[PDB]
Design a protein around this ligand. Structure first.
Ligand SMILES: OC[C@H]1O[C@@H]2O[C@H]3[C@H](O)[C@@H](O)[C@@H](O[C@H]4[C@H](O)[C@@H](O)[C@@H](O[C@H]5[C@H](O)[C@@H](O)[C@@H](O[C@H]6[C@H](O)[C@@H](O)[C@@H](O[C@H]7[C@H](O)[C@@H](O)[C@@H](O[C@H]8[C@H](O)[C@@H](O)[C@@H](O[C@H]1[C@H](O)[C@H]2O)O[C@@H]8CO)O[C@@H]7CO)O[C@@H]6CO)O[C@@H]5CO)O[C@@H]4CO)O[C@@H]3CO
Length: 477
């Protein structure tokens, strides 16, 4: 019977928050997304008889390992752990600002949070609740079962109960890499990786590729070559992945879905057999093309183009829908795809796996449980591992010879280069590369630093600048 082949590929990444001179983690986001998403997203595979795939960047793996070993010195978590009597004013301020930053998210819907944010001054017990409810807001699906007492309590937390939550949270972190190994060993999902620090490979290989989609921009003089670094990002990622999973990775997620003819050749030369990228790149590159085929770039490497609509539905729209209606809508779209082709379509749903859930009611758990429970029971839908997608015989395929370089942001590079502020970071990087002495220059090549550059309304955005500049400084020493 004619199946629809469905492929989820959840991308997990954090830039390095660990400042190199102090060793301090200047932002807590790796901790909070580890305890909330990085274990719990693959742990859905314990309860639902489907396949789900994951990408982990090596720089994220490094940080998970440091927290699991108890070695991460996290400045914001220190303000959470302390007895409020020991908090400095600056730490209380950071606590309030962090809460206000997250205040409108449904995972922060505690009545006690509302009371605390309307009080003009907080005493010790009120600050204990503020600290503990910030922790509990980030609680993942697994511990929502075991901490139900504390969660329904909702207020009047003790220092000892807060330390108990912290202990359970670190237990989740300690099990996180093991669950990825486990679902891989069990055949329930493939795990991929990306070039080590999530750089923009097409720019490192050939900055002129930005002109293919945006010819009216100016970019700085790349007076030194980054081509060898692009190679090192891929090679070091392969080595880290082997250490964790015991194989060389044959699938990679290109950061920001970013490809070019040169980048595809590099992935081929490094032994990658398959990657995915964005539908906008497909439409920019091939006339009349469908994203439901397996493509062979120059007969060198396999490429899938994600279904942008389905991926954007989960990432941008469904957070505001009733979970039941969202799942029924999603199935109805898969039905239309299935009825619309006479071959068996391959549908790639690819997006970040940790950022959208905080905007869903109950951290996305009603939505994903309903979605996965429905998918495991649809006999005309077969969810696939990446390995199954690449080896399946009864799929339609097409050879293509050229792509227009781009990313999944509008098919171009303008969110990372081309304006005055963003170009300033590239100029800093270029001049530092000329004098670089160690691999901290590779850290500074990560895309996150250039993404935030120019952003002036984001609280904590100065922290990303402090990190970038520290890595650039350390690279030259
Ligand atoms: O650098 C820190 C960051 O690193 C990782 O994120 C990278 C990710 O791994 C890459 O794949 C890529 O992500 C792209 C993404 O997949 C696309 O969807 C899109 O992003 C859009 C968002 O999906 C969309 O929601 C919206 O974002 C806006 C928010 O809606 C708005 O509320 C606000 O967001 C603020 C947050 O509420 C606040 O918490 C804080 O954000 C912090 C994160 O919470 C924290 O985890 C961390 O983020 C990590 C991330 O988890 C990694 O996966 O630090 C953040 C900063 O402190 O502050 C936010 C800003 O005030 O504003 C945002 C807009 O910024 O729109 C976006 C844009 O369309 O595009 C992505 C890029 O192609 O890149 C990211 C970043 O490098």
């Amino acid at each position: 019977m004619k199946k629809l082949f469905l492929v989820f590929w959840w991308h997990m990444h954090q830039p390095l928050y660990r400042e190199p001179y102090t060793g301090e983690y200047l932002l807590p986001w790796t901790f909070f997304h580890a305890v909330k998403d990085y274990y719990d997203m693959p742990a859905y595979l314990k309860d639902f008889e489907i396949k789900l795939n994951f990408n982990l960047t090596p720089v994220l793996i490094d940080q998970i390992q440091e927290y699991a070993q108890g070695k991460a010195k996290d400045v914001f978590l220190e303000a959470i752990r302390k007895d409020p009597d020991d908090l400095e004013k600056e730490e209380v301020e950071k606590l309030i600002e962090f809460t206000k930053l997250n205040y409108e998210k449904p995972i922060y819907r505690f009545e006690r949070i509302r009371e605390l944010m309307n009080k003009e001054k907080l005493n010790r017990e009120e600050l204990l609740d503020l600290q503990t409810l910030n922790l509990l807001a980030w609680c993942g699906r697994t511990l929502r079962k075991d901490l139900k007492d504390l969660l329904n309590k909702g207020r009047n937390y003790t220092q000892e109960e807060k330390e108990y939550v912290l202990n359970k949270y670190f237990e989740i972190i300690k099990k996180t890499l093991s669950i990825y190994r486990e679902i891989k060993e069990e055949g329930k999902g493939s795990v991929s990786t990306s070039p080590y620090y999530h750089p923009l490979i097409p720019i490192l290989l050939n900055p002129n590729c930005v002109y293919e989609t945006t010819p009216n921009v100016k970019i700085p003089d790349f007076a030194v070559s980054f081509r060898e670094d692009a190679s090192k990002h891929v090679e070091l990622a392969k080595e880290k992945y082997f250490e964790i999973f015991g194989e060389h990775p044959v699938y990679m997620w290109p950061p920001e879905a970013s490809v070019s003819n040169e980048a595809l050749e590099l992935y081929y030369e490094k032994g990658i057999n398959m990657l995915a990228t964005d539908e906008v790149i497909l439409k920019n590159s091939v006339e009349r093309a469908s994203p439901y085929l397996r493509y062979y770039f120059r007969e060198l490497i396999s490429v899938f183009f994600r279904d942008k609509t389905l991926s954007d539905l989960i990432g941008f729209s469904y957070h505001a829908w009733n979970a039941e209606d969202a799942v029924r809508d999603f199935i109805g779209r898969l039905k239309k795809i299935h009825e619309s082709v006479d071959f068996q379509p391959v549908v790639f749903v690819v997006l970040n796996g940790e950022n959208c859930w905080e905007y869903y009611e109950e951290n996305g758990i009603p939505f994903l449980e309903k979605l996965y429970s429905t998918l495991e029971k649809e006999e005309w839908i077969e969810t696939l591992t990446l390995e199954e997608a690449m080896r399946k015989e009864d799929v339609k395929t097409e050879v293509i010879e050229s792509v227009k370089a781009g990313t999944w942001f509008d098919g171009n590079f303008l969110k990372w280069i081309g304006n005055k502020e963003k170009n300033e970071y590239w100029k800093i990087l270029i001049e530092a590369k000329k004098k670089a002495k160690n691999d901290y220059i590779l850290v500074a090549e990560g895309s996150d630093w250039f993404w935030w550059q120019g952003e002036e309304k984001a609280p904590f955005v100065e922290v990303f600048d402090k990190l970038f500049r520290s890595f650039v400084r350390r690279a030259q020493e």
